[PDB]
Amino acid sequence: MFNNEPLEQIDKELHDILADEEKRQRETINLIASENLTNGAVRECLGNRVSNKYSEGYPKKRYYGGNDFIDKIEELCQKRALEAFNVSDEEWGVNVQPLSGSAANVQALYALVGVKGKIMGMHLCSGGHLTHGFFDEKKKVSITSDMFESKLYKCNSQGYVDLDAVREMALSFKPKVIICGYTSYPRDIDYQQFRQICDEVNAYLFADISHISSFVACNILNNPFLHADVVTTTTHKILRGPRSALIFFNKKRNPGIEQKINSAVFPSFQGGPHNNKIAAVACQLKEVHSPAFKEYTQQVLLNSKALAKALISKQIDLVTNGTDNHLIVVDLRKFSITGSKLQETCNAINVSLNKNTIPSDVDCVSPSGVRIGTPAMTTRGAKEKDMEFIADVLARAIKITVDLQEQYGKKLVDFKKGLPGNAQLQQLKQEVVTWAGALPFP
Amino acid sequence: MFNNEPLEQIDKELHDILADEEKRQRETINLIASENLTNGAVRECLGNRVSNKYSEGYPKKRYYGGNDFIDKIEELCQKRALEAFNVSDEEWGVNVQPLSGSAANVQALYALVGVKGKIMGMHLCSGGHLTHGFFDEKKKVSITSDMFESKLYKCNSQGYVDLDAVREMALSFKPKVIICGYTSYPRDIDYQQFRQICDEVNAYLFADISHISSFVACNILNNPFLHADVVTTTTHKILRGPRSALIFFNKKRNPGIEQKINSAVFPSFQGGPHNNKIAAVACQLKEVHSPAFKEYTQQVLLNSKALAKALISKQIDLVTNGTDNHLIVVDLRKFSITGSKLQETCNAINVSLNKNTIPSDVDCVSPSGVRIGTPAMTTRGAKEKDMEFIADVLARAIKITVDLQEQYGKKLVDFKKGLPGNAQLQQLKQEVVTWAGALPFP
Ligand SMILES: Cc1[nH]nc2c1[C@]1(C(C#N)=C(N)O2)c2cc(-c3ccncc3)cc(F)c2CC1(C)C
Ligand SMILES: Cc1[nH]nc2c1[C@]1(C(C#N)=C(N)O2)c2cc(-c3ccncc3)cc(F)c2CC1(C)C
Ligand SMILES: Cc1ncc(COP(=O)(O)O)c(CNCC(=O)O)c1O
Ligand SMILES: Cc1ncc(COP(=O)(O)O)c(CNCC(=O)O)c1O
Ligand SMILES: [Cl-]
């Protein structure tokens, strides 16, 4: 007593939008630093009948029975995540139930410090996440500012983590956790120097490596596992898995953190886990360990180097003047256009990128840059040589944006009027569509 | 630069466990009141490349572009949700982003009350959810007891919401929210008397209808939309959709609540939404507004009344002595076997059900009943006539449980020792497997 007709026939209205969405992804230069494209196997897991099953609790300690095949999957996902990040299951544990990045961070923070607890992280404007304590004078925007007591450290005028600022704040504020690892930070991190500050004031070290996860697993970038008490990561960005998250905790440095963190996820915050997610992560964690995937991650860095280098070659300014990872932030101040304008322009040509703040910006409205990343396009087969084109396309857009701002004026309402019925954008969109459209597409 | 090999090729190890899970679901009389089986369409959505897209924010007010086909899907799902629950889009708004029920409720509670905010809900033992303020003497087990100030109201010695206790407790506590709608409550709810109590003390009324959602949509049970400020529901139980949740808010009653609830889901708590969930929820909400689904929901009730009747005809006691909905709680005190033991036994014979406290129980260690529900088996095409069989199988199991407790004793460690190899269980399992194995399976 159900309907087994295929999606096409049962809901034709929806199937059309999805086939459109499918086409727009195929036909887009995707420089969203946090996006990727999942393979069929990860998606077959996501659509598996395992999500039918309620499995509250943990493996071998479920409230309900019938969880024997579920337990094998959750155990196989946990092991593979400790294997993938080069940690012994004797020293490190992993929770695989957070439904996404923001949940895992709120969860892990609560575990360490509890309500009214004291935390530090990078300000949103300098490159931190909302879940790293973000507030404004008007309102506590994130639960991490309101259910904890948060204070925020900035990057210097050049865009680097300023450790002398972290120490000045840690000793006066005396927090219980300091968060590093970021959302738009183009360089590697000094986890050791962070440990020195945290050891000084009896604070926990929290590394959110969601943007750089693969770099950490593949030993290309610095390993926070040698220093951090807690490591969180999403599974959907550079790691190229489903939308989910992992919480890592160091047992040796902190006895009884295992209990604190597992009970924070359930039953403190979540109910039933989503087993199709857990299955899908297991599927990608296998691939994350293979030598094929090390090559891809190397390739993500080689594309990001090439891209920053080519953008500098066309006299485009980059925050910190370059990158140690998959991401770049462009300082657009010399062209007197906002980051929002270039986004609008880039969307008109099937270029996905996003607006992003720079050190000179005081407010989050009217951000002066854009963030770009290489994992998505790297996933679609682009090589070092294709980065010149992406650079040419973005230069062309910066220029088109300058022309249109002078014609229609400097107000976002007026600017957009310019975008439709501009012959250069249609010209540029087409070029984008032909090159992108034919790239390998999982 | 990806691996496109099919799941069975890429990860044979995982693919086996999944095919086993599938076999066990096919061969199980599933009486878990909160489970169901999703059709292939809802599973194709969950496996759609729409999950690739980052779309932080709400429709027409997104942080990144590229979100025109995502906006269409998030707009389709909200409308289809409001139609299905018989509410005007002028009077009611819905948020479709919550990742699961427990998230929806933490998010919605925060919107109304904020941190340190005062709440009331039904105790866990008496049939309410963890997210309705559950704590113990030992610990604040839910975040809803810790980030909020919660008080809990019991059912009477017969299993019924005791309104006169709700008033006594509301008037001396003075909460800002009172929560009704429940996890294991076998009867309909008097939303009007809750509304009257809520008005009297100026509190909000919060109805969580996750277990009864379909009965409300189809006008079979009382409508909490006529009385509540907020209604939450999961989409994966009786509604037969994916793992997700909806938050409903009444604008007419509470001006400026739309912003409060939307800003609570993002950016207070969540980041990017899971678009494959959103798509999948749309696909099910089409189905929920069809009379084929009224036919099914009616059938879930007809089965549940019939099952209760057949259980009583075998002198098995039920809490409240029957059911108004999809769920029964068996009071196992007369057989002097616990719920834990019957669960253990029922797993041994491929009957999935769960242990459940009863009004006479003081504490949740050794609960004296089990909960059963009809949605899953109704979905596999069972009818009224088949409930005598389920009843008869549950009776046979209760009896085997008494025998094994006589022989091996009343300690759970010693009890289970009896289960493996028992000739009658093997007998009973074969019968379960042959009947279940045969039933239509989406
Ligand atoms: C939404 C979100 N989530 N975690 C984030 C963001 C970012 C952001 C940046 N910069 C950082 N670092 O991380 C962001 C935030 C705000 C914002 C401004 C004011 N109030 C709330 C949000 C505006 C933005 F353009 C962005 C770009 C972003 C998505 C990468
Ligand atoms: C896990 C969970 N989540 N929301 C729930 C439960 C239940 C439960 C019942 N009764 C109710 N009413 O709703 C439950 C909870 C606890 C429990 C006791 C102490 N500490 C944590 C959990 C033990 C149980 F056997 C159950 C049965 C259940 C799953 C239906
Ligand atoms: C460092 C960091 N942490 C957590 C998250 C949260 O993930 P969820 O969206 O899955 O909650 C993000 C995503 N940030 C958005 C972006 O950079 O594009 C992030 O950049
Ligand atoms: C009333 C109620 N509310 C919220 C939830 C939370 O759903 P998530 O598991 O998606 O967080 C449940 C499920 N409780 C499990 C059961 O009764 O079987 C529930 O019964
Ligand atoms: Cl999902």
Q: Find the helix or strand (DSSP H, E) in which B246 lies.
A: strand B245-250
Nearest to A258 by CA among A50, A61, A54, A55: A61
The alpha carbons of chain B give a radius of gyration, in whole angstroms, of 23
Strands A117-122 and A148-153: parallel
* Cβ-contact A243, A219 below 8 angstroms: no
Q: Give this entry's resolution in angstroms.
A: 2.4
Nearest to B29 by CA among B318, B387, B296, B306: B387
Six-digit token pair at A300?
């993500």
* Cβ-contact B113, B177 below 8 angstroms: yes
Q: Which residues contact B200 (CB under 8 A, 6 or more apart)?
A: B167, B170, B171
Of the partner residues A65, A76, A379, the one whose CB lies closest to the CB of residue B343: A65
Could you give phi then psi for residue B367, rounded to 5 degrees? -70, 140
Could you give phi then psi for residue A128, rounded to 5 degrees? -75, 175
Six-digit token pair at A103?
């949940």
Nearest to B351 by CA among B244, B422, B433, B426: B433
Domain A11-35+299-442 grouped into CATH 3.40.50.720: no
Chain A residue numbers touching B124 (CB-CB < 8 A)? none
Q: Which of B34, B106, B123, B124 is the pocket-test mutation for ligand 2 (most atoms within 8 Å of CB)? A: B124
Could you give phi then psi for residue A43, rounded to 5 degrees? -70, -35
Residues 12-41 of A with CB under 8 A from B: 13-14, 17-18, 20-22, 24-25, 28, 32, 34-41
How much distance in Å is there from the Cα of B339 to the middle of ligand 3? 42
Q: Find the helix or strand (DSSP H, E) in which B22 lies.
A: helix B12-26
* Cβ-contact A10, B41 below 8 angstroms: yes
Query: How many angstroms from the chain centroid is the CA of residue A320?
Result: 20
Nearest to B262 by CA among B53, B55, B57, B54: B57
3-state secondary structure of B90: coil
Six-digit token pair at B131?
């997210």
How much distance in Å is there from the Cα of B124 to the middle of ligand 2? 7
At position B253, the amino acid (one-letter code) is R
**Measured distance between the N- and C-terminal CA atoms of chain A, rounded to whole angstroms:** 35
Q: Which residues contact B77 (CB under 8 A, 6 or more apart)?
A: B96, B278, B279, B281, B282, B285
How much distance in Å is there from the Cα of A67 to the middle of ligand 2? 16
3-state secondary structure of B1: coil
Q: Is A269 in CB contact (< 8 Å) with chain B?
A: yes
**Measured distance between the N- and C-terminal CA atoms of chain B, rounded to whole angstroms:** 35
Q: Which of B31, B100, B106, B130 is the pocket-test mutation for ligand 2 (most atoms within 8 Å of CB)? A: B130
Could you give phi then psi for residue B209, rounded to 5 degrees? -105, 25
Could you give phi then psi for residue A94, rounded to 5 degrees? -135, 130
Matching residue, tokens 């750089």: A212
Closest chain A CA to residue B2 = A379
Topology of domain A36-298, per CATH?
Aspartate Aminotransferase; domain 2 (3.40.640)
* Cβ-contact B181, B224 below 8 angstroms: yes
The C-alpha atoms of residue A357 and residue A312 are separated, in whole angstroms, by 19
Cα torsion B264, B267, B268, B272: sign? positive
What are the pocket residues of ligand 4 if the criterion is a CB atom closer than 6 Å to any ligand atom? A 54, 271-272; B 34, 100-102, 129, 131, 182-183, 208, 210-211, 234
* Cβ-contact B424, B401 below 8 angstroms: no
Q: Closest ligand to A231 CA?
A: 3
The C-alpha atoms of residue A383 and residue A377 are separated, in whole angstroms, by 9
The C-alpha atoms of residue B296 and residue B379 are separated, in whole angstroms, by 8
Q: Is B90 in CB contact (< 8 Å) with chain A?
A: no
Q: What is the number of other CB atoms lying within 10 angstroms of the CB of residue B168? A: 12
3-state secondary structure of B29: strand
SS (H, E, C) chain A: CCCCCCHHHHCHHHHHHHHHHHHHHHCCEECCCCCCCCCHHHHHHHCCHHHHCCCCEECCEECCCCCHHHHHHHHHHHHHHHHHCCCCCCCEEEECCCCCHHHHHHHHHHHHHCCCEEEEEECCCCCCCHHHCCCCCCCCCCHHHHCEEEEEECECCCCCECHHHHHHHHHHHCCCEEEECCCCCCCCCCHHHHHHHHHHHCCEEEEECCCCHHHHHCCCCCCHHHCCCEEEEECCCCCCCCCCEEEEEECCCCCCHHHHHHHHHHHHHCCCCCHHHHHHHHHHHHHHHCHHHHHHHHHHHHHHHHHHHHHHHCCCEEHHHCCCCCEEEEECHHHCCCHHHHHHHHHHCCEECEEECCCCCCCCCCCCEEEEECHHHHHCCCCHHHHHHHHHHHHHHHHHHHHHHHHHCCCHHHHHHHCCCCHHHHHHHHHHHHHHHCCCCC
Q: What is the number of other CB atoms lying within 10 angstroms of the CB of residue B208? A: 30
Do the domains spanning B11-35+299-442 and B36-298 agree at the CATH topology level? no
Q: Exposed, middle or buried by CB within 10 Å (0-12, 13-18, 19+), for B148?
A: buried
* Cβ-contact A206, A182 below 8 angstroms: no
Instruction: Domain ranges for chain A, please list them.
Output: 11-35+299-442, 36-298
> What's the length of chain A?
442
The C-alpha atoms of residue A357 and residue B93 are separated, in whole angstroms, by 33
Nearest to A200 by CA among A120, A116, A261, A131: A120
Least Cα separation, residue B52 to chain A (angstroms): 6
* Cβ-contact B325, B341 below 8 angstroms: no
Least Cα separation, residue A301 to chain B (angstroms): 14
Output B414-417 pairs: Cβ under 8 A, ≥24 positions apart: B415/B341, B415/B344, B416/B344
The C-alpha atoms of residue A67 and residue A83 are separated, in whole angstroms, by 24
The C-alpha atoms of residue A415 and residue A7 are separated, in whole angstroms, by 40
Q: Closest ligand to B38 CA?
A: 5
Of the partner residues B7, B14, B271, the one whose CB lies closest to the CB of residue A102: B271
Around B149, how many Cα atoms within 13 Å sit in the side-chain half-sphere? 8
The C-alpha atoms of residue B56 and residue B54 are separated, in whole angstroms, by 6
How many CB pairs below 8 A link A and B? 291
Closest ligand 1 atom, CA of A184? 12
* Cβ-contact B107, B268 below 8 angstroms: yes
Q: What is the number of other CB atoms lying within 10 angstroms of the CB of residue B138? A: 6
Nearest to A346 by CA among A393, A415, A402, A407: A393
SS (H, E, C) B348-364: HCCEECEEECCCCCCCC
Residues 339-398 of A with CB under 8 A from B: 343-344, 346-347, 352, 354-355, 378-381
